[PDB]
């Protein structure tokens, strides 16, 4: 009775979740080094909904894509424009938002 | 020592294979009905490398995308342009290529 594509979408969705939950389990906790900046950071999560194509707001509100950010700042051309972002959450970020989240590219990050 | 994106690609690849091998197991063997043509066919495989955006060659060699095919022939607008194709292989196709493979869209196919 059902549409093949709908059946396929449901199987896809279960497998996507498995993959994302497998990556996070494996990566969350580790520290990475930037080849250009040689600075270290802990991986606290993965933003599966963000990509280097996306923009972030600077201090005065100016928007820049991560592609434009890495090219203008380091002379780095990001090859994989569809990769997710690695999140590093700071230790004094809210009260009852006091600090923003740090965002690294898997392409420029090295395990250890 | 490794790049996070490379590690992620390897996990992605294992999960993609699992998904594709799960879909094929579930679908191969079943017969589907086209809402526009009301004709039936057995699913013999799934072409994961083809999409409705892709083209097929007609008898005299004229190329047409499946998008243009369904719109010009049935007045059907294909909504999901990234879906794979369902394969139906015929029973007198080669000797020692005598017949081509049949190709259906999951979006226009109904299980039974």
Task: Give the SSE layout.
Two copies of one chain form a homodimer.
Chain A: H1 4-27, E1 31-34, E2 40-42, E3 45-47, E4 55-57, E5 63-65, H2 66-74, E6 85-88, E7 102-104, E8 109-110
Antiparallel strand pairs in A: 1-2, 1-8, 3-6, 4-5, 6-7
Q: In CATH, what is the homologous superfamily of chain A?
A: paz domain
**What's the story with the biggest beta sheet of chain A?**
3 strands, antiparallel
Structural class of chain A: alpha+beta
**Straight-line N-to-C gap of chain A:** 51 Å
CATH architecture of chain A: Beta Complex
Q: What coarse outline of chain A follows from CA principal-axis ratios? A: globular
Number of domains of chain A: 1
Oligomer: homodimer
The CATH class of chain A is identified as: Mainly Beta
Care to count the β-strands of chain A? 8
CATH fold description of chain A: paz domain
Family (chains A, B): Belongs to the argonaute family. Piwi subfamily.
Organism (chains A, B): Homo sapiens
Protein name (chains A, B): Piwi-like protein 2
Subcellular location (chains A, B): Cytoplasm
Model description:
Two copies of one chain form a homodimer. Chain A is α+β, with helices and mostly antiparallel strands and 112 residues long. Chain A has one domain (1-112): paz domain, CATH 2.170.260. The first copy, chain A, is built from two helices and eight strands. A three-stranded antiparallel β-sheet of chain A has the order 2-1-8, with no helix packed on it. In chain A, β1 and β2 form a beta hairpin. The longest helix of chain A is centred in the N-terminal third of the chain and has 24 residues, at 4-27. The first copy, chain A, is globular. Chain A binds chain B through residues 1-5, 7-8, 11-12, 15, 18-19, 22-23, 26-27, 32, 43, 80, 83-84, 86, 105-107, 109-112, and chain B through 1-5, 7-8, 11-12, 15, 18-19, 22-23, 26-27, 32, 43, 80, 83-84, 86, 105-107, 109-112.
């Amino acid at each position: 009775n059902d549409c093949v594509l709908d059946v396929m979408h449901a199987i896809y969705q279960q497998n996507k979740e498995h993959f994302q939950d497998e990556c996070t389990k494996l990566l969350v906790g580790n520290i990475v080094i930037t080849r250009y900046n040689n600075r270290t950071y802990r991986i606290d999560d993965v933003d599966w909904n963000k990509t280097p194509k996306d923009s972030f707001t600077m201090s005065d509100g100016k928007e820049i894509t991560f592609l434009e950010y890495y090219s203008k700042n380091y002379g780095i051309t990001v090859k994989e424009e569809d990769q997710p972002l690695l999140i590093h959450r700071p230790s004094e970020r809210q009260d009852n938002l006091l600090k923003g989240e740090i965002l690294l590219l898997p392409e420029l990050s090295f395990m250890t």
